Symmetry: C2
Subunit: 90 residues, 2 copies
């Protein structure tokens, strides 16, 4: 049900995000060959926490900038849960 | 603002979908090297119409099954608009 994903940030975090009208922040894509991919992050997962931030109470714009601004080399810890729905490949 | 994407369906349509609580059906991924990719479908686009179906008034489950069930070789026409938000790669 929950998953803890930990990787060292490279030049980018290797993720894209999606959400709606304050209904949670979701993984909308994981970069191929990235540390995030290697460690098991998946499209459709809800992000609950990144490092010391509650990702269930953050506005969209901050969620984006927080991840962009983490320095290269720093460890990123994501707690994810496996409002939005996502289909499989069709 | 709008885009019309037309391709011949292969073994799969080459797309994944996302939505919320009846807030529209969105492109959540486009398969690399697919006809859909070649013709310009992009993650974050809202699907307005597929063939002769109003994709703004269809429940999630039908949206999925409709696309799965289209036969191989049939032309797929998607009208897309460039409730959900999607970030860029971070």
């Amino acid at each position: 049900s929950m998953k803890l994903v930990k990787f060292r940030k490279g030049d980018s975090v290797g993720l894209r995000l999606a959400g709606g009208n304050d209904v949670g922040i979701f993984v909308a894509g994981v970069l191929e060959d990235s540390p995030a991919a290697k460690e098991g992050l998946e499209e459709g997962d809800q992000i609950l926490r990144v490092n010391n931030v509650d990702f269930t109470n953050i506005i969209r714009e901050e969620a984006v900038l927080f991840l962009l601004d983490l320095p290269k080399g720093e460890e990123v810890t994501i707690l994810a849960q496996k409002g939005l729905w996502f289909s499989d490949w069709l």
